[PDB]
Every structure is written in C-alpha cells, then in structure tokens.
Design goal:
The structure is cut from a larger assembly and holds chains A, B, C, D and E. Chain B has four helices and four strands. Chain B is α+β, with helices and mostly antiparallel strands. The longest helix of chain C has 15 residues. The chains are: A alpha+beta, B alpha+beta, C alpha+beta, D mainly beta, E alpha+beta. The complex binds potassium ion, magnesium ion and zinc ion. Chain B: Part of the ribosomal stalk of the 50S ribosomal subunit. Interacts with L10 and the large rRNA to form the base of the stalk. L10 forms an elongated spine to which L12 dimers bind in a sequential fashion forming a multimeric L10(L12)X complex.
RNA sequence: ACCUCGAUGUCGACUCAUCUCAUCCUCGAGCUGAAGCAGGUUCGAAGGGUUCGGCUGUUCGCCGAUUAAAGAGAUACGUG
RNA sequence: UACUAAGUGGAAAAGGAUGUGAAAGUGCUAAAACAGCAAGGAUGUUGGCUUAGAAGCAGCCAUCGUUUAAAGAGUGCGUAA
C-alpha cells in the first residue's frame, strides 16, 4: 500500500538520522553462509547489514537530509551496513570479510556525518 | 568440496578422496587425533579442496534427533504424529540444543531452542 | 452398472430429449457440477465409465453425487432380420439427459482437483459438457 | 514426430508455436514433438 | 520492445545512407547492403551518434517490421564494426579438416571425399585440425556456412561424435 | 423394394488391363525401451513393379520353394 | 460502416490451439511493472524404513523449525550411495 511504503521509508529515514556510519556495499558474491557469517562477526548488537533496494535507500537518505550520497547507491546492487557508537570496527570487520572471501565491492559511505569514498575504506579499516 | 561421514575411531581402508589428489597417508593420523574425545561415534567431516593440495578440515556433531529418542526414553517414535507416544520437558530440550550449537547455525540460544522444537515434533513428542 | 431392479412395462416409448431440462437445472449437493449443452441418451455403461473416472481421480477424501439415472429401457432388434413381425427385445438402459442438467457433482476436495476430475469425467459422456459452481 | 488430432504440452518447457498455419509443440526432449492440430 | 530502441551509431567509420528501397551501411570491415521491400511502413531517421525509428500506424505487420528492421540494423552495424564468427568443434576419431585455396575440405568417416566452396566475404580458419573458426561480416552468411558444414555428419548421442557447435551439451543415450 | 420380368446372363478361371491410397517393395524424414546389423511405429509419396506350384469347381485358404516384395480395394463383387 | 486472410465464403462432428476483432471486470505500473541479464538460493540432515550400494532424488513414514533479502526433508534433471 502507499501507507506501508511510507512507513518503511520513515523508519529507515529515522534510523539514518541517528547512525554513526552508513556504508554501501555491493551484495555480489555473498553466500547464504557468508550472509550469516558477516552478521555473526558484526557480533555486538549495535550494527546491521541488510540488502536494501535503491529506491528505498534514496528516499530514506533524501528525507534524512543526506547529499552527494546518491553516487554510493547510484546504478548498483546496494547492501547497507549501519553501525552505532564506535563505528570504525564495523568497517574493519566488513573489509576483512571480503578479503577472506573471493571478492566483494566496497563502494563508500558516510562516517560520523562525513562522506568518504571507496578508496578511503582501506584507510578506515 | 566432498563431505563424508568418516568414522572417528578408524581411518585407513579407502580411496574416493584419492582422485581429489588428497594424500591419504598424511591425513589419517589427523582424523584419529581431535576425534579421540568422541570415540565410537560416526563423525561427519567437511573437506575443502585447495589448489595447492593443502587441506583444512571441520568436524561436526552426531546427527540431530537421535538424542531425542534418548531423552524421550523410547527407542523409536510414532509413525503417526497425532499418536503422542512420548513427552519431553523444555528444560531437557535446553541440554540437547547446547550439544548441537557447533553444528547449528542458530543466532541465539533461544532460537537454538526453536530449531530443536521443530525436530521434537517430528518424533510426535509433546513439548512440556 | 446402474439398472432398475424391476420395471412395470418392458418396452416403452422413446423419450425425445429436445427440451430445456425439466428438473435438475442447477447443482444441488456439491460445489461444482457438470452441465450438458446438447441433450442426448447416455446409457448405463457410460454412467459407469464416468463414475469410475471421477472415483479414480478423486482420491480418498471427497465425495461424488450422480444426479441422473437410467430409468428408461431401450430395445434393439436382432441383426440380419426383416422388419415387422414384432418388437425387438430390450437390450440396454439409458438415462435421458436434457440440455442443461447437472448430472455429476463433487465435494470436499480442492478447486483445481475438482475441475480436473470433472474434465476427466465429461470426456466419457457424449454431451458437450460445461462446468458450473454452486450459487450462494 | 507425433501426429495427433489434439496437441497439448507434456513437459514444463514444451512450448506451443504456430508454423506454416500448423500448431506444433517443441520441447528440449525430442520425444515431445507434435503436429496437425 | 526492440522497435523502440535507441541505436547508437558510433561516428567512427560507420555511415548510414537510406535510399528509397536500399540501405547502405559502411564501416571499417566491409560495406553492407540491405534490400528493403517497397511499401515499408517505417520512417527511418538518423541523428549524429544516435538513431530512432518509428512506424506510422498500429497495423500488425507494421509492428513486426518496427522491431525486425531495428534488429537487422543493429546486427549490420555490429557486424560492420566488429564482425561475426562461429566456432565448430569437429569431434571424432578419424575426423579432420583443412583449407585449400577457396575450398574447405573435410575428412570424415566417409569413403567419399568431401570438399566445399566458401562464399565471398566469409573466411574459415582451421587453427587446430579439430577446430573450425568461420569469420564473416553478416550473421546470416556465417550461420549458413556453419550449417552447410554441419549437415555432413550430425552429432550422435550414443557417442558425442559429430560437427558439434562449440559449447553445445548434446544429450546422452547409453547403449550396451 | 424406387428402375428393370413384351428377359439388365449369374461363380471361378483365361485374355486385357484401368483407377484409388488407407502402401508390400523401391524412395525421402522424424521418434525410439535405435550402440552396429536387422528392426517398431509415425509423416510424405501412387512413377514403376507386385512369382511359380500341389490339393480343391474354386474365390478365400493350408502347404512347398523362391523373391526386394508376393499390397487392401474399385470398375454391373470389370471383362460370355 | 466494421469483420474476414481462411479461396473461408464454395460440405461435417467429439476434441486441440499465443489466429484476429469487440465488451466487461479484476491485479501490478515512472517509490520503476513483465520477460531477459549480474549475484545468492543455507543449517538442522547422512531424521528414519533399507537397499554391498538409496544419505534432497528407486520408492516409502512425519514431511517442519532455525541464519536472512531468500530458500521447496527440496523445482525438476542427473549420481552403485
Ligand atoms: K427382370
Ligand atoms: Mg459365342
Ligand atoms: Zn516435454
């Protein structure tokens, strides 16, 4: 329904308004065990990793008042990692998770209200 | 990757992993090492196959729902689910779920209970 | 084989089926029924074939109601005989089926399975069948 | 080739086409070819 | 739909000139000619580094042409800019292939000698004795010659032997 | 029981064949519980060919030995 | 003024069919639809009957919980397991 979609956008927008990290990742080459393994490593219950469709992400980021973050979610498969408080460890966790696996892309995101690029992910990790 | 149910007390008569380029003589000692804590049981083992003929192995628990027969006190469950032959306390299910944790991919102990609850119902056992 | 146990008069007038289904117009016991769109005579043998088809494809869950019945007999003169000099013996019984009589009907089993059962039935009957559902 | 008065798909992938005004069926398993209606 | 598809005619060496009943498409590999029939209901207009074409009406055959000439234009463009090729694995025991001048000759289980004349614009190559690589400019001719080679000894399921097209999984029937 | 009784000659064989295809062979193709050989069935095809003998009034048939095969039918159950 | 592509019209059925036209509603649709293309499509489980060999697949008895965006004691194919 229009109402169901609005609720999903509003909930996501509200979550992005209190996040300390939003990091965009291609979901390519991620196995079912890998999906449970990455979440399990993210151990502490303050972080989430979810495959989210672009249209939801875009509306949610737009209403959370984010800008220039469109490129991370532009024309690509887009899982999201969003953590709370000490956000640096979450980036290292996902960075060592790909490296352990065959491959995975790490597009970029926002750290503590600041845009970073794909190349800057290694710096944080 | 070829999974096999190699017995824990014995590993020596055999060839279906020999076409993988596995050096059988070097790994038979390893199967009888870590498995010696659970001798007399048939332990499943995952076998990854690296290109360089290196190999690393992961042992697993004895198959699920076999333990449910022991907790129920009855050698075999009903052939018909509506026929409630046996009953098991929820506290006894906690003891069973903990054993399976290494095999189970369950996120929580409370979820690990729920996974075993779908196995107890297969035997027709009441959850009390 | 459906057959009246005993009848009063052994050789009656043939009943023309050219009508619009006096009686049995509508399905009355199940959810789906088989209707005819061209009146005809279907004998006891065809009712048997249709019944066994429905039963075989129905499984051990549902129920089938047969609405028509071969009340009327019918004669057939023996072969290689001149005409006249009597009326031939009765041979086979037949149920008159006017256009639009819900003759078979099923119950207590999924939808698609009933539709398939009815289609498997109506291919034995000569009448151009059709599928009707109970009203409400 | 099966020539039959009534042609209906037998497999999941046996599609139905109409070639030269004649309805036919094609399956990856060649046992299912049909023709003439 | 393919009728409403935006062709990107790259202005490197590919030029397109529409006459009343012919289209001439030229590129780095070799000029291609398309023989359109009269009463064509499509209106072909081209832009710089783009092409869009539309039909006048909604008639059925017009709707078919709207797609099929778009497809032919795209295939002609891609052929004249890159060229097509087909690849045939000649699999068997005493089978082999080779070229002699314009004629590709073949040895199969036949007691009869096998030769075949290659048409213009198609070049075959036998890089290995059990491989044929047929290179052309239009899909139609390369496919035609591929099947003219293949007709001679079709594959079998009992043993995979045949003029198998590369990467085709012939089914298996096991006889004893 | 409609023409034919102020006559339309009837079985089988002989001679001569003619035509149809729902094909026996020859020919082309598919599917196969088709490895090969040989087949089973289906599709198209009627150009041509399609045995000799014993017994029987014979057709039909049973049997022998052949052949690539020894077709089913029609033509007043063709043809005095 | 529409309909027909079949020489229908200019013989005929049970039955089969993405032929084409008309009308009626119903469902998704530019917070991206349908097809196709790029990823994944798991653990309990090798539940047990038992077959030298049947462990998702020769068949048979219950035929569900669990990790997540997703998962069928597995859609079907294909394995002496
Ligand atoms: K007379
Ligand atoms: Mg005379
Ligand atoms: Zn099929």
């Amino acid at each position: 329904a229009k109402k169901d979609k609005a609720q999903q956008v509003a909930d996501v927008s509200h979550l992005l308004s209190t996040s300390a990290g939003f990091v965009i990742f291609d979901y390519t080459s991620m196995s079912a065990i890998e999906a449970t393994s990455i979440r399990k490593k993210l151990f502490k219950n303050g972080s989430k990793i979810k495959v989210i469709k672009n249209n939801i992400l875009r509306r949610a980021l737009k209403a959370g008042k984010f800008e220039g973050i469109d490129e991370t979610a532009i024309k690509g498969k887009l899982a999201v990692a969003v953590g709370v408080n000490e956000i640096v460890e979450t980036l290292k966790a996902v960075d060592g998770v790909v490296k352990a696996k065959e491959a995975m892309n790490f597009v970029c995101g926002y750290f503590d209200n600041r845009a970073f690029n794909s190349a800057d992910l290694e710096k944080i990790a | 990757i070829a999974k096999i149910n190699l017995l824990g007390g014995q590993a020596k008569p055999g060839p279906a992993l020999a076409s993988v380029g596995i050096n059988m003589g070097e790994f038979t000692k390893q199967f009888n090492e870590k498995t010696k804590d659970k001798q007399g049981e048939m332990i499943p083992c995952v076998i990854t196959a690296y290109n360089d003929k290196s190999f690393d192995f992961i042992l697993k628990t004895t198959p699920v729902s076999i333990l449910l027969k022991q907790a129920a006190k009855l050698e075999k469950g009903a052939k018909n689910a509506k026929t409630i032959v046996g009953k098991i306390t929820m506290a006894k299910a906690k003891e069973i779920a903990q054993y399976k944790l290494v095999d189970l991919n369950a996120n929580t102990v409370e979820a690990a209970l729920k996974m075993v609850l779908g196995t107890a119902k297969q035997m027709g056992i009441e959850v009390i | 084989m459906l057959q009246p146990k005993r009848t009063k008069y052994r050789k009656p007038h043939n009943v023309s089926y050219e009508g619009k289904a006096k009686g049995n117009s509508y399905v009355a016991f199940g959810e789906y029924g088989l209707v005819a769109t061209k009146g005809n005579w279907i004998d006891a043998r065809a009712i048997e074939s249709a019944r066994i088809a429905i039963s075989k494809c129905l499984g051990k869950t549902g129920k089938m109601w047969i609405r028509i019945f071969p009340h009327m007999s019918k004669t057939k003169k023996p072969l290689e005989v001149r005409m006249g000099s009597g009326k031939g013996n009765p041979e086979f019984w037949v149920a008159v089926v006017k256009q639009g009589t819900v003759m078979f009907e099923v119950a207590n089993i999924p939808e698609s399975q009933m539709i398939k059962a009815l289609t498997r039935a109506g291919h034995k009957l000569p009448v151009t069948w059709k599928i009707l559902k109970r009203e409400e | 080739m099966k020539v039959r008065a009534s042609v209906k798909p037998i497999c999941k992938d046996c599609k139905i086409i109409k070639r030269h005004q004649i309805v036919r069926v094609i399956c990856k398993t060649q046992k299912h070819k049909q023709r003439q209606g | 739909k393919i009728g409403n598809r935006t062709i990107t005619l790259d202005p490197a060496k590919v030029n397109l000139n529409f006459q009343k009943d012919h289209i001439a498409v030229k590129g780095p590999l070799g000029q291609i000619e398309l023989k359109l029939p009269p009463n064509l209901p499509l209106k072909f207009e081209l832009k710089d580094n783009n092409l869009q074409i539309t039909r006048n009406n909604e008639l059925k055959q017009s709707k078919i042409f709207h797609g099929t000439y778009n497809a032919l234009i795209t295939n002609a463009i891609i052929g004249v800019t890159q060229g097509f090729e087909k690849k045939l694995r000649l699999v068997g025991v005493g089978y082999r292939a080779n070229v002699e001048g314009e004629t590709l000759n073949l040895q199969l289980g036949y007691s009869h000698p096998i030769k075949e004349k290659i048409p213009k614009g198609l070049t075959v190559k036998v890089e290995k004795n059990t491989e044929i690589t047929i290179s052309g400019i239009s899909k139609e001719l390369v496919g035609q010659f591929a099947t003219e080679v293949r007709k001679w000894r079709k594959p079998e399921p009992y043993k995979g032997k045949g003029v198998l097209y590369f990467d085709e999984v012939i089914v298996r029937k096991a006889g004893k």
